[PDB]
DNA sequence: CTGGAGAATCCCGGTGCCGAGGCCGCTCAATTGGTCGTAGACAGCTCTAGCACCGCTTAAACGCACGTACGCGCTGTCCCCCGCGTTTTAACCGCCAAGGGGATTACTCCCTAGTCTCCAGGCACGTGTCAGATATATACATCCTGT
DNA sequence: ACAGGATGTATATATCTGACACGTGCCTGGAGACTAGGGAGTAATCCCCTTGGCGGTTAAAACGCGGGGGACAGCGCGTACGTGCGTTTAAGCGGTGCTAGAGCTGTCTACGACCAATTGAGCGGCCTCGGCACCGGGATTCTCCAG
């Protein structure tokens, strides 16, 4: 009965956000869960390493900025930073 | 009795769970303290990457005349894009197959 | 009777196998191999079917990549028939030996 | 005992076909079933080390995934 | 004319001079053609009537491929603009198309003045006033139009 | 008029030599290619998505 | 019933709608075939400010009518 | 030459505004529809076969 | 009468010489110019530490030496002794840098 | 600082090849050796400059370069 | 006035600083709690590895007929030994050079 | 005037112990310093990572032993684990 | 295949110096000694899942014949690279001069950890249906061999 | 190159079926409000290393020329590997049964975080000397060409 954590609901929401009339198999959902976990782990590890480098003690938006800039290549990095900054400004304005 | 609760994801206009990302950051023991905007930023990035890869996979599946994404479609979507391939250069996808290619030398002529 | 010139059946086999994604090794003998290898380290282990399936997937992916690289080597040598020389060259360049 | 032979010649041939080779020399089979044994040993050693650390007796899919991903060979679709 | 962006700016200015939309105007900067200055007359049928808003814009080299950046110079009160003047535009940040020109941008911002986007709370106070206190909202719009003349 | 009519609208620097199958528009191949590679899989004309197989070289 | 909706770049997009269809539904169709979210649209007919909660018949929109689709924008 | 270039070659009187999906040849509307109603899956340039789903309106 | 070695002997001699020493085989000042030019594209008016430049140069020489060992293996595999762009491309492709 | 790649000079490339253990060098090696070196330098300098501009400084440092190299899986010893 | 301070390295019969290792383990936020024997074991491992590599380097230097260990000797010691070569296959030693070897094909016949 | 920490003293002591009549240059000392730091980071990261995997919150001798078994290959690992177990047993005895 | 010539290499000796090595503060990091909350060891119960077995089907493996396409060796060539002398270039070294930016110190204040509450989004569980696989009759493209 | 027969291969239709997308109960983790304290953002200062310039030496790069050996094309031989057929074989599927142990829950105790006070050893500085690189000369060896 132990609760288990996954991103299936959100992956499905994004799927019907982008393609209104497309399904997704259970194995595909599992692969996407693994992919999201892996990317999260990579970015968090890089951000923690940056914080340790600069002798800081907190992971603010700048560390995630730079970690993304280091991981994602080129246009992916550009678009990701754009939308992430958009989101953070929207949040702080809210 | 306090106020109509609005989830942080909604406040930021994202579908990924900002609260869950924040909890994972705190529990994973990545740093002594975690900033306020870090979960928001990370959730936005994850949402973008997921949306991109899902869009490519859906395009591939539609081009294959099917309405249900599967690991084969995911593998094609990844390996046909140079940037996603570079990001995922060292990952194996179960039941993924390979891109269909043959070197020109082998083809008869 | 009808007879294909050598090579065309090979092309058809490549086309069919590069399109499907089933497993290309037999499950029971692969499992027996895995158990035989594992029994050296510690005795009388048990394996989850999912674990053995993951091992098959990883092994097939690794071997397929190795074969792409050794095919590139063989073509580099101005041939079409891969050889243990090609296999060892690929392994050495990828830093596995 | 002596179960490496389970990896049969036609199985190797179709693996290489998926790889994209036209014809295959006769000696490739021994070499490739040696390479596979080496790779299996390397992965299984780490998997067994993990499970033995966890006071378990059943190698687990998560254990195999961790072993593989320790070698820069991350595998998706098992956890 | 040295680059596609510069020639596009040339023809945009030519079209603005030849047939500018209703109640809008634009002018470059003497020292930087890439910098732009515009004055807009408030749209009819809205609280923003008789409004004289001053704008400033910045461009880059690959324009016919990216959206520029814009900001107000006069006082602003709008759910789609930040307090400093960071103006929130989809065709300018999310859904840009090369087909758009400066005149299209000006008309689009006039339309935004007409209708704030409900899910675009650049100013939470302005958004709340529009949603609930409509009367106070046009009162504030009239006040900002009043000091927009200076 | 004619040159403007049958030149690629978005750039208006060279000719119409590409078609977008999803909305059946006609732009120039290098515009299409750069927008694809910059991850704007989204038509300029009708603002609609597409893929790598929805646009092809056309001649007029 | 086909209707004409005009953009700001000389394009007219053809929408097949019905008089009873709401402005919100028209904007949703515009999202479907033009990728413009309904909250990111301002539809104007005969100089009138259309509202999502109203219908085409409310504003007296006839066949082959021209609607000026100028967006309400968010960056 | 612009009028002659842009008009379809089957008639040379009406403007070419249709494209055939598989072979990508520019022609007119009603000439192509009449030919297809005449059962002829025949292209005047490549002789490629087609079907009811192998054509559609295109506007420049 | 002039004395000329057979083509190859001095090549082997200088191979033996260079695999014995550990100096830095690229000219330091032009390498520094190249590094500064390359960094010009990411952040103008950048300053460098001499130690940083030396670290870059060391890493680059090590990388090129490894690449050339792999290229030589490729050329030997092709049944010849002269390395060529196709050999370099094969090495990089197999290693996964391309 | 325009067109300095020629600084990586022919005999220097030959010396590197000799250290690699090469007997004969074709005449076309030099162009793609320049290209490979340039690609490697961009790949490293981009990360180093990213680290630097995150740390809010105008001076690249040996530590930044070492971290960039370690990130690319080619850790370098002797610099800290 | 409690007792003579016997450092943990001396107590365990090692050379490396047990206290320093423990401090680094705590400060590195690798975990919220650190066991007592963990720094001891880690120091033992580090001391063993450094002793091994230094022994090999000293032997190489003596063979070269020098009384000082230098990057060249370290590089030779690391790469000549097979286990150490595998352990440190991805590192670059400054002023290291390479192992003197020539493919037999190149050598004249 | 900041004080920076290193392992030079301990490296020198072990060098003297193993070879009483050998010196070590400053650059070699720096290389050894970097090597020690690298191995420390590898082993400690692996141990903490195991601790996280097993839902544990305390790094212990067992985690360090498993980490070294995973990192060091073959006979090197066997000798290292023997030395580590001997050291911990002596420490607990004293 | 066997001997001189010459270049390169190797070996021994005197010498200067600058970096390794030993010694003296002293101050901060290690140590020692209680103290207390709790993470982890340990006992017990369960019921999930892996191991083991057996019978039947048949798909896949195994073995054999063949002939042909490709691997491999021998040969001619010519042109592209290597060795060498000479001239030109700029790297290198030493010195000097200016200052922009790295590194440290103090202060404050604004952000974030910690706590209690509650309520709604998300997870386990059910369920009907439509996407997908499969069987079959097509229509059409493709390979091989005679022409 | 052309044509036709044999063999794949694509296409439309009809069918079962089970994985999936929706719906429901409920429950615990995220949101809201509050407080307290310390991490770091900012300002000021010091001076260190970076940049820039200059001039003199000469070591290395650039250029040219001759020639020779090695990459490449060609040709011919043979052998071993793909193709297809007929005969095993054992994988695969189903069903059954048993039981180790993975997972969970409940207790309880050693044990590591934490604080305070004490001190000594490792860091910075500061001399001091010999290991080593170098320059000079003598002895040895590899390679080339003539014999
Ligand atoms: C993303 O953000 C960057 C950062 O300034 C900006 O230059 C770019 O225009 C943005 N792209 C968008 C909003 O698509
Ligand atoms: Zn264009
Ligand atoms: Zn379109
Ligand atoms: Zn026509
Ligand atoms: Zn045609």
Walk me through this protein's architecture.
Chain G: It is a peripheral membrane protein. Chain G: This is Ubiquitin B. Chain G: Residues 1-75 form the Ubiquitin-like domain. The structure holds 12 protein chains of 8 kinds. Chain D has 79 residues and is mostly helical. Chain D has a single domain, classed as Histone, subunit A (Orthogonal Bundle), CATH 1.10.20.10. Chain D is 58% helix and 9% strand. Chain D is elongated, with a radius of gyration of 16 Å. Chain D starts with 8 loop residues before the first helix and ends with a strand. Chain E is globular. Chain E has one domain (1-150). In chain E, 37% of the residues lie in helices and 15% in strands. With 150 residues, chain E is α+β, with helices and mostly antiparallel strands. In chain E, 36% of the residues are buried. Chain E has a 4-stranded antiparallel beta sheet with strand order 1-2-3-4, with helices on one face. Chain F has one domain. Chain F is of the alpha+beta class and 60 residues long. Chain F is globular and about 30 Å long. Chains A and B meet through α1, β1, α2, β2 and α3 of A and α1, α2, β1, α3 and β2 of B. β1 of chain I pairs parallel with β1 (24-25) of chain J. 2-acetamido-2-deoxy-beta-D-glucopyranose binds at residues 66, 93 of chain E. One zinc ion is lined by residues 8, 10-11, 27-28, 31 of chain F. Chain I binds a DNA duplex (147 and 147 nucleotides) through α1 and α2.
In short:
The structure holds twelve protein chains of eight kinds. Chain C has 97 residues and is mostly helical. Chain C is 65% helix and 4% strand.
- Principal-axis shape of chain E equals globular
Summing up helix and strand content along with how strands pair, one would put the structural category of chain E as: alpha+beta
Count of strand segments of chain F? 3
Number of helices of chain E: 5
- How would you spell out the order of helices and strands of chain F? HEEHE
- Judging from the principal axes of the Cα atoms, what is the shape of chain F? globular
The total count of helices of chain F amounts to: 2
The tally of domains of chain F stands at 1
- How large, in whole angstroms, is the Cα Rg of chain F? 11 Å
For the report, how would you describe the main beta sheet of chain F?
Answer: 3 strands, antiparallel
End-to-end Cα distance of chain F, whole Å, is 17 Å
- Proportion of strand residues of chain E: 5-15%
Oligomer: heterododecamer
Helical residue percent of chain E?
Answer: 25-40%
Which sequence of SSEs, written as H and E, runs from N to C of chain E? HEEEEHHHH
Ligands bound, unique: 2-acetamido-2-deoxy-beta-D-glucopyranose, zinc ion
Strand order of the largest sheet of chain E: 1-2-3-4
- Beta-strand portion of chain F reads 15-25%
From the N-terminal CA to the C-terminal CA of chain E, the straight-line distance is 35 Å
Radius of gyration of chain E: 16 Å
PDB class: nuclear protein
Keywords: RNF20, RNF40, H2BS112GlcNAc, O-GlcNAcylation, nuclear protein
Assembly: tetradecameric
Entry title: cryo-EM structure of RNF20/RNF40-RAD6A-Ub in complex with H2BS112GlcNAc nucleosome
């Amino acid at each position: 009965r132990s609760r288990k954590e996954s991103y299936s609901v959100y992956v499905y929401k994004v799927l019907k956000q982008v393609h209104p009339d497309t399904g997704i198999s259970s194995k595909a959902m599992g692969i996407m869960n693994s992919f999201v976990n892996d990317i999260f782990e990579r970015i968090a590890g890089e951000a923690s390493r940056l914080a340790h480098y600069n002798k800081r003690s907190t992971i603010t938006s700048r560390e995630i900025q730079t970690a993304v800039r280091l991981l994602l290549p080129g246009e992916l990095a550009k678009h990701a930073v754009s939308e992430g900054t958009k989101a953070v400004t929207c949040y702080t304005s809210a | 009795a306090r106020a109509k609760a609005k989830t942080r994801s909604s406040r930021a206009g994202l579908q990924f769970p900002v609260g869950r990302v924040h909890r994972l950051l705190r529990k994973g023991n990545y740093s002594e303290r975690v900033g306020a905007g870090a979960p928001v930023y990370l959730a936005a990035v994850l949402e973008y990457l997921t949306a991109e890869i899902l869009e490519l996979a859906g395009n591939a599946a539609r081009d294959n005349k099917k309405t249900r994404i599967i690991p084969r479609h995911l593998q094609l979507a990844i390996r046909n894009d140079e940037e996603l391939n570079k990001l995922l250069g060292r990952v194996t996808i179960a039941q993924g197959g390979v891109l269909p290619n043959i070197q020109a030398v082998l083809l008869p002529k | 009777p009808h007879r294909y010139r050598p090579g065309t059946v090979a092309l058809r086999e490549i086309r069919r196998y590069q399109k499907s994604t089933e497993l290309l090794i037999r499950k029971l003998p692969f499992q027996r191999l895995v158990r035989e290898i594992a029994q050296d380290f510690k005795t009388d282990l048990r394996f989850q079917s999912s674990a053995v399936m993951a091992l098959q997937e990883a092994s097939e992916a690794y071997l397929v990549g190795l074969f792409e690289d050794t095919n590139l080597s063989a073509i580099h040598a101005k041939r079409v028939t891969i050889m243990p020389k090609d296999i060892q060259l690929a392994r050495r360049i990828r830093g596995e030996r | 005992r002596d179960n490496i032979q389970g990896i049969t010649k036609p199985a190797i041939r179709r693996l290489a076909r998926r790889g994209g080779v036209k014809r295959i020399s006769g000696l490739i089979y021994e070499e490739t079933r040696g390479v596979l044994k080496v790779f299996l040993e390397n992965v299984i050693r780490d998997a067994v080390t993990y499970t033995e650390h966890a006071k378990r007796k059943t190698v687990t899919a998560m254990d195999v995934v961790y072993a593989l991903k320790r070698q820069g060979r991350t595998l998706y679709g098992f956890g | 004319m040295s680059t596609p962006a510069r020639r596009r700016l040339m023809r945009d200015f030519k079209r603005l001079q030849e047939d500018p939309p209703a109640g809008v105007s634009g002018a470059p900067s003497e020292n930087n053609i890439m910098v732009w200055n515009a004055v807009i007359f408030g749209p009819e049928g809205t609280p923003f009537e008789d409004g004289t808003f001053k704008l400033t814009i910045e461009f880059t080299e690959e324009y016919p491929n990216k959206p520029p950046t814009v900001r107000f110079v006069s006082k602003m009160f709008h759910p789609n603009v930040y307090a400093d003047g960071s103006i929130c535009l989809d065709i300018l940040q999310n859904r840009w198309s090369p087909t758009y020109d400066v005149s299209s941008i000006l008309t689009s911002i006039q339309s935004l003045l007409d209708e704030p986007n409900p899910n675009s709370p650049a100013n939470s106070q302005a958004a709340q006033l529009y949603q609930e206190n409509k009367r106070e909202y046009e009162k504030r719009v009239s006040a900002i139009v009043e000091q927009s003349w200076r | 008029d004619y040159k403007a009519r049958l030149t690629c609208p978005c750039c208006n620097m060279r000719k119409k030599d590409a078609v977008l199958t999803k909305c059946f528009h006609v732009f120039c191949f290098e515009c299409v290619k750069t927008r694809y590679d910059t991850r704007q899989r989204k038509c300029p004309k009708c603002n609609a998505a597409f893929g790598a197989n929805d646009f092809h070289r056309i001649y007029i | 019933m086909q209707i004409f909706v005009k953009t700001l770049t000389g394009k007219t997009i053809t929408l097949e709608v019905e008089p009873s269809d709401t402005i919100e539904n028209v904007k949703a169709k515009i999202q479907d075939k033009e990728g413009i979210p309904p909250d990111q649209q301002r539809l104007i007919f005969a100089g009138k400010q259309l509202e999502d909660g109203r219908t085409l018949s409310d504003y007296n929109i006839q066949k082959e009518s021209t609607l000026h689709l100028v967006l309400r924008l968010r960056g």
